[PDB]
From TrEMBL, chain A:
It comes from Staphylococcus phage 812. This is Uncharacterized protein.
From TrEMBL, chain B:
It comes from the Viruses. The lineage of its organism: Viruses, Duplodnaviria, Heunggongvirae, Uroviricota, Caudoviricetes. This is Peptidase C51 domain-containing protein. Coiled coil: none annotated.
UniProtKB/TrEMBL annotation, chain C:
The chain holds residues 143 to 295 of 295 of the full protein. One of its GO terms (biological process) is proteolysis. It comes from the Viruses. Belongs to the peptidase C40 family. GO terms for molecular function: cysteine-type peptidase activity. Keywords: Hydrolase, Protease, Thiol protease. Residues 3-148 form the NlpC/P60 domain. This is NlpC/P60 domain-containing protein. The lineage of its organism: Viruses, Duplodnaviria, Heunggongvirae, Uroviricota, Caudoviricetes.
Automatic annotation (TrEMBL), chain D:
The lineage of its organism: Viruses, Duplodnaviria, Heunggongvirae, Uroviricota, Caudoviricetes. Residues 94-169 form the Baseplate protein J-like barrel domain. It comes from the Viruses. This is Baseplate component. InterPro entries: Barrel_Baseplate_J-like.
Length: 154, 132, 153, 348
């Protein structure tokens, strides 16, 4: 937010009984999500006057009726994107946001990611989204192992 | 060419610099200007190759420069009196802010490539160079 | 608008205003509309009397220097270019200038016409009248202005 | 050939694995066997998904190959510009095809070039010529009054400007558009039908809107580009290409287009009482303009469609929308086309 603007669709998407045999969630907002979300909700952020990259995962979620068919799981996806969006911001700019994220906060995102991934598997409309989220499920695990180590380095 | 009028009976061209051999190249970046400069003369440079000309053997693509900081340009063909295209190529380059050289095309082995890119002394552009 | 209503009123009353007569720099002290007696008025004084009838006052004699610094006008088209196709975009009540040194002015009315006094120089007895723009288009000089009352003072 | 989600695969795999022994049943996340089997099931899941996607792409490609109805590539952007001379002209002066036009604005560096010559008639004062954009995509859709200069000597030219925006610059057609085009193509194999003449006249790539009006003994065709202006070259090309679909015993005419004007006034109650300034209103007016300008002759203004379009914004922001003037659906005559006039938007 401090350095560069962001797309209008992502800003609009982010401001806002099934069971798996392997997973259960808990809807904790990460401490970094808690303070970044307020900034997104407020107008103090630059934003762009045009949109491109229609292949992103955000437009995929928008195109499907997941909002009205399963608003619970639509909510969880917003939570996944909220944590995932914030941890991209700190490395590229504003390092002062560090020491506000813990491996437990990052860990439960995989819990929530797979708890929604099973649900998405029951309706093969959402295959395009399923394919995407599985790629991120291994991405976070790497960050969890390196986050305690990186924090001491920085 | 000094003594050529190139007139027409009761007709004329609305753009100036016509009738005479003046040619004007316009672009908002080096890759836009350099494309027009090279493309103006490259095809007609014909040779006796059994198979084509220099345009097949030279890609002269994937050019870039500081488009944001450079405005629109009106670079003239005859900026240099009877000079070579290399002399006119240097003006377009605007050294040392942009680096021009001839080198083999690693991405397409078997043929050469004309490179025109912003200088790699920038931090992110420095990291974009392949390490050896 | 004020200028369009005044131009329409002048057009409607143009045939009854034959008492008014042409002169080079007629600046009479009597109002032409408040007197049945004939009176010699030029285009500048005519516009002054026409605007004075309402609440606006402007200034007297309202020579060419009035348009320079008083800030009562904003230019629509500058002098020195002369396009015949962009005449249709004009509107009633726009002031039309004439002559190479701002000798005379006019008021535009629709259907490609204008209202002005034309006649021989040494105090012609011809009354006010409306002429076609086709013959006078040569001496138009491209200068056009417009009025604005809301923001002034 | 069906999806099987990761956990389904993994479960079947472990269930099979446990047959014949009971020295494996410990599958905590720390276990390495679980990790290997999770990775195998992940790869099998991805394989199934990519297989299904590639099947769909194969279906599309066969549909391409069978009927030779190739997808439309990138479409050039073009329009009209006005040349303004210092004085009315003194000779039958001439512009050659392939004269360049460039915008002095730094935010639109894209160039334009002409394709057909023009001669300016003597004692003329303006001329309208067509310019085609070298680049193809969204960048050709410049705003109004963007092309300032001709990027040449311009000895007798003072300034150049465009009175209308460029709308024909469009990106490559999506799958859905191609499917719609193909379903009209399949339904258009029988000639002498209105649905057939639709494809008949839509086959030209440049045409976007098209409508056909019929009567007792005459057929008429109404079509236009995205800008909404018919050209004589397009009419000629339509006549040339459409011979294979024209009814034999009935005359055909391709002409007729009018811009129907309507003023839209809406009232929007934003959920946030804060941040109700005219900046968001400008954005809303620009979205309404883009929506209304996108319609074609065959489409008609509907209240509910407008409501949907404007409410694409997140319903948490905008809570209510209402129209003070619009209370019934407007029916567009076949020849005319509904578009935005002068729009006025306010909070309350």
């Amino acid at each position: 937010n401090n350095f560069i603007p962001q797309p209008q669709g992502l800003l609009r998407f982010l401001n806002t009984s099934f069971v798996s045999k392997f997973y259960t969630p808990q809807l904790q907002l990460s401490e970094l999500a808690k303070k970044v979300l307020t900034n997104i909700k407020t107008d103090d952020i630059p934003v762009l006057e045009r949109e491109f990259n229609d292949n992103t995962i955000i437009h995929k979620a928008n195109d499907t009726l997941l909002k009205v068919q399963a608003p619970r799981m639509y909510m969880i996806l917003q939570s996944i994107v909220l944590e995932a969006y914030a941890i991209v911001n700190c490395f590229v700019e504003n390092p002062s946001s560090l020491k506000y994220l813990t491996e437990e906060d990052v860990s439960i995102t995989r819990e929530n990611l797979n708890y929604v991934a099973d649900y998405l598997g029951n309706y093969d409309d959402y295959n395009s989204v399923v394919l995407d989220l599985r790629d991120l499920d291994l991405c976070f695990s790497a960050i969890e192992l390196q986050l305690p180590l990186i924090k001491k380095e920085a | 060419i000094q003594e050529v009028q190139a007139v027409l009976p009761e007709v004329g061209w609305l753009i100036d610099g016509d009738g005479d051999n003046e040619v004007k190249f316009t672009g908002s970046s080096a890759h836009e200007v350099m494309t027009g400069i090279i493309r103006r003369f490259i095809p007609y440079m014909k040779y006796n190759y059994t198979e084509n000309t220099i345009d097949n053997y030279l890609d002269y693509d994937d050019l870039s420069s500081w488009d944001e900081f450079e405005k629109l340009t009106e670079v003239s063909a005859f900026t240099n009196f009877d000079g070579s295209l290399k002399q006119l190529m240097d003006m377009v380059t605007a050294r040392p802010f942009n680096e021009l050289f001839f080198k083999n095309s690693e991405k397409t082995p078997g043929k050469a490539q004309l490179v025109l890119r912003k200088t790699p002394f920038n931090p992110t552009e420095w990291r974009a160079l392949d390490m050896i | 608008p004020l200028s369009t209503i005044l131009a329409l009123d002048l057009n409607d009353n143009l045939k009854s205003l034959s008492n008014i007569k042409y002169m080079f720099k007629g600046a009479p002290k009597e109002n032409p509309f408040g007197t049945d007696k004939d009176v010699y008025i030029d285009t500048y004084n005519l516009l002054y009397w026409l605007y004075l009838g309402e609440d606006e006052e402007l200034a007297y004699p309202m020579n060419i220097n009035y348009f320079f610094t008083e800030g009562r006008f904003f230019t629509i088209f500058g002098k020195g270019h002369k396009y015949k196709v962009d005449v249709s975009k004009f509107i009633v009540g726009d002031i039309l200038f004439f002559g190479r040194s701002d000798t005379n002015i006019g008021i535009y009315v629709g259907d490609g016409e204008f209202i002005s006094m034309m006649g021989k120089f040494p105090k012609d007895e011809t009354p006010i009248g409306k002429y076609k723009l086709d013959d006078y288009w040569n001496e138009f000089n491209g200068r056009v202005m417009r009025f604005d009352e809301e923001v002034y003072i | 050939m069906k999806t099987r989600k990761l956990t389904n695969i993994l479960s079947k795999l472990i269930d099979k694995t446990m047959a014949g022994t009971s020295k494996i049943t410990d599958f905590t996340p720390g276990s390495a066997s679980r990790s290997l089997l999770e990775a195998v099931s992940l790869e099998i899941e991805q394989f199934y998904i990519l297989t299904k996607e590639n099947i769909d792409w194969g279906i599309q490609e066969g549909i391409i190959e069978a009927f030779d109805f190739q997808k439309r590539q990138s479409k050039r952007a073009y329009g009209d510009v006005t040349i303004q001379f210092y004085q009315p002209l003194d000779m039958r002066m001439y512009i050659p095809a392939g004269t360049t036009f460039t915008s002095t604005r730094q935010e639109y560096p894209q160039q334009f070039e002409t394709l057909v010559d023009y001669y300016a008639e003597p004692d003329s004062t303006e001329i309208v010529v067509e310019v085609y954009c070298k680049e193809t995509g969204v960048a050709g859709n410049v705003p109004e009054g963007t092309i300032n200069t001709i990027a040449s000597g311009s000895s007798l030219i003072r300034s150049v400007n465009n009175e209308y925006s460029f709308n024909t610059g469009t990106k490559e057609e999506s799958q859905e558009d191609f499917k719609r085009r193909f379903h009209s193509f399949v339904e258009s194999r029988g000639r002498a039908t209105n649905k057939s003449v639709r494809y008949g006249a839509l086959q030209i790539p440049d045409v976007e809107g098209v409508y056909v009006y019929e009567e007792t003994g005459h057929i008429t065709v109404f079509a236009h580009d995205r800008n909404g202006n018919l050209s004589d070259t397009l009419k000629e090309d339509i006549i040339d290409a459409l011979q294979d679909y024209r009814p034999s015993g009935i005359m055909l005419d391709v002409t007729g287009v009018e811009k129907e004007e309507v003023n839209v006034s809406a009232t929007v109650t934003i959920s946030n009482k804060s941040r109700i300034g005219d900046t968001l209103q400008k954005h809303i007016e620009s979205v309404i303009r883009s929506y209304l300008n996108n319609l074609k002759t065959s489409d008609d203004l509907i209240i509910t469609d407008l409501i949907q379009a404007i409410m694409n914004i997140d319903d948490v922001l905008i809570y209510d929308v209402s129209f003070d003037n619009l209370d019934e659906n407007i029916i567009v005559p076949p020849q005319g086309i509904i578009r935005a006039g002068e729009i006025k938007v306010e909070l309350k």
